[PDB]
C-alpha cells in the first residue's frame, strides 16, 4: 500500500472507434473501441505505488462474458516478460488500478505499453444518437473520441415486430460440473400494435448450426416477462431497467409451454403493449473455447406474417 502516483506518469494515447464489420454503422453490440497507450513512469516511483485508469459511463471493459475482463490484466515488459504492475478491476466504479512491482526499483526510465479492446456501454445510450462521447483517463490525462451510434431497426413484417440480444454468455470449456449459462432478452411488439392471438416461440435450434450448444427445456430454462407502459422508450442496446417495467411473469405461468427441438412457447393473446421477455438457461457441455450458440425468437399473430429475430455466437 504505497502512494497514488498518477501525477508521476505521462502518456501518449489513442482511443479509436472500430467499425468491426465495416458496415458504416456504429453499434455497441458489433463494434468496439481500441485503446492504445505508451506510458512513461517517473524514476521516483517505487514498488507498491499505484496508478489508475478510469473510463466514462459509455465505456465498459467486458462484452457478453463478465469473466473475460482479463486480456486487461498485468502490464509486462515484452523484452523480458517481467511484470511491471499488477491489475485489479472495480468495474462497478469504472476503474482499473495498477500496482507497481519491484520492477520500478530495478529499472530506470520505466515505460509500459497497453493495447486493449474495450466496449460501448448501452446503459446511457437508449436510442440512436450522434456524437456520443467515450473517454478514458490514464493517470490524470483524458483521451476522448465520439461516434454516431446507429442501432439497427427492429425486425418487422406486417404488424408484427420483434428484437433480441444475448445479454450475458459464460461457457466453461471442458467443465462437466458447470458448463455455464446464457441470457437472452427479446422485445415483443416494440411497435406497440394491437395484436390478436400473439404467440412467441423461442428455440435453441437452427439447421445451419448442428454444433449448437444452446439448450431450452422445463428443466434448465427460466423465463421472466415484463410489460412496458405505452410509449415507453426501450433501450435499443437491450440494457433493461427492469424496475421501470411491470413484472407480469406470474400472469404467464399458464401460458408457457415447452416443445420439441429445444423450443418454448409464450401465449400473449391480445396485446397492444411492448413486452420484454428475459430467457435464462444453461449451456450444454463443450470442449470448445468458442462454442456455437444460436437461439431464435419468432412472433406470430392473426392477420400477419410471422417475424423472426435471433442471436448467434
The residue within the footprint of Ca ion, chosen from 12, 16, 21, 178 (CB under 5 A), is 21
Q: State how far the Cα of 267 lies from the Cα of 80, in Å rounded to an integer.
A: 62
Binding of a copy of itself by 230 (CB under 8 A): yes
Residue 289 in contact with residue 196, Cβ under 8 Å? no
Q: Which does 113 bind (CB under 5 to 8 A by kind): Ca ion, a copy of itself, none?
A: none
Q: Which does 30 bind (CB under 5 to 8 A by kind): a copy of itself, Ca ion, none?
A: Ca ion
User: Taking the complex as a whole, how short is the minimal distance between the CB of residue 94 and a copy of itself, in angstroms?
Assistant: 8
Q: State how far the Cα of 127 lies from the Cα of 191, in Å rounded to an integer.
A: 14
Q: Which does 21 bind (CB under 5 to 8 A by kind): Ca ion, a copy of itself, none?
A: Ca ion
Binding of a copy of itself by 93 (CB under 8 A): yes
Binding of a copy of itself by 310 (CB under 8 A): no
Residue 41 in contact with residue 104, Cβ under 8 Å? yes
User: Taking the complex as a whole, how short is the minimal distance between the CB of residue 261 and a copy of itself, in angstroms?
Assistant: 5
Binding of Ca ion by 31 (CB under 5 A): yes
With contacts defined by CB under 8 A, name the span among 167-175, 186-194, 242-250, 281-289 that binds a copy of itself: 242-250
Residue 175 in contact with residue 257, Cβ under 8 Å? no
Which helix (H) or strand (E) segment holds residue 36: the answer is strand 32-41
The residue within the footprint of Ca ion, chosen from 3, 10, 18, 19 (CB under 5 A), is 19
Residue 19 in contact with residue 64, Cβ under 8 Å? no
Letter string b/e over residues 104-132, b meaning 16 or more CB atoms within 10 A of that residue's CB: beeeeebebebebebbbbbeebeebeeeb
SS3 242: helix
The residue within the footprint of Ca ion, chosen from 10, 30, 83, 99 (CB under 5 A), is 30
Q: State how far the Cα of 295 lies from the Cα of 290, in Å rounded to an integer.
A: 16
With contacts defined by CB under 8 A, name the span among 3-11, 19-27, 113-121, 239-247 that binds a copy of itself: 239-247
The residue within the footprint of a copy of itself, chosen from 22, 207, 218, 253 (CB under 8 A), is 207
Q: Which does 232 bind (CB under 5 to 8 A by kind): a copy of itself, Ca ion, none?
A: a copy of itself
Name the nearest CA neighbour of 184 among 309, 279, 267, 299: 279
With contacts defined by CB under 5 A, name the span among 18-26, 200-208, 251-259, 287-295 that binds Ca ion: 18-26
Which residue carries 445510450 as its cell? 125
Q: Which does 288 bind (CB under 5 to 8 A by kind): Ca ion, a copy of itself, none?
A: none
Could you give the C-alpha distances from 173 to 180, 288, 290, in angstroms and in order?
Answer: 9, 6, 9
Query: What are the residues binding a copy of itself (CB under 8 A)?
Result: 57, 93, 124, 126-127, 197, 205, 207, 210, 229-230, 232-233, 235, 243-246, 259-261, 302-303
Amino acid at each position: 500500500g504505497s502512494k497514488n502516483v498518477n501525477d508521476l506518469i505521462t502518456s501518449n494515447t489513442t482511443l479509436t472507434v472500430v467499425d468491426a464489420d465495416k458496415n458504416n454503422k456504429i453499434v455497441p453490440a458489433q463494434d468496439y473501441l481500441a485503446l492504445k497507450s505508451q506510458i512513461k513512469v517517473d524514476d521516483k516511483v517505487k514498488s507498491g505505488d499505484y496508478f489508475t485508469i478510469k473510463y466514462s459511463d459509455t465505456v465498459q471493459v467486458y462484452g457478453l462474458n463478465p469473466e473475460d475482463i482479463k486480456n486487461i490484466g498485468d502490464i509486462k515488459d515484452p523484452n523480458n516478460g517481467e511484470t511491471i504492475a499488477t491489475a485489479k478491476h472495480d468495474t462497478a466504479n469504472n476503474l482499473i488500478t495498477y500496482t507497481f512491482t519491484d520492477y520500478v526499483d530495478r529499472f530506470n526510465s520505466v515505460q509500459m505499453g497497453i493495447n486493449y479492446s474495450i466496449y460501448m456501454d448501452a446503459d446511457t445510450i437508449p436510442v440512436s444518437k450522434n456524437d456520443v462521447e467515450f473517454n478514458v483517463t490514464i493517470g490524470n490525462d483524458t483521451t476522448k473520441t465520439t461516434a454516431n451510434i446507429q442501432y439497427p431497426d427492429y425486425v418487422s413484417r406486417d404488424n408484427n415486430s420483434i428484437g433480441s440480444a444475448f445479454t450475458e454468455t459464460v461457457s466453461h470449456a471442458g467443465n462437466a460440473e458447470d458448463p455455464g449459462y446464457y441470457k437472452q432478452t427479446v422485445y415483443v411488439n416494440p411497435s406497440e400494435k394491437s395484436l390478436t392471438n400473439a404467440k412467441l416461440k423461442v428455440e435453441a435450434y437452427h439447421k445451419d448450426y448442428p454444433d449448437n450448444v444452446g439448450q431450452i427445456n422445463k428443466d434448465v430454462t427460466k423465463i421472466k416477462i415484463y410489460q412496458a407502459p405505452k410509449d415507453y422508450v426501450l433501450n435499443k442496446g437491450y440494457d433493461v431497467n427492469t424496475n421501470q417495467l411491470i413484472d407480469v411473469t406470474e400472469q404467464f405461468k399458464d401460458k408457457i409451454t415447452y416443445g420439441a427441438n429445444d423450443s418454448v412457447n409464450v401465449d400473449f393473446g391480445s396485446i397492444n403493449n411492448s413486452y420484454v421477455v428475459m430467457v435464462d438457461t444453461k449451456f450444454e457441455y463443450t470442449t470448445s473455447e468458442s462454442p456455437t450458440l444460436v437461439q431464435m425468437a419468432t412472433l406470430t399473430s392473426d392477420g400477419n406474417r410471422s417475424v423472426s429475430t435471433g442471436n448467434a455466437a
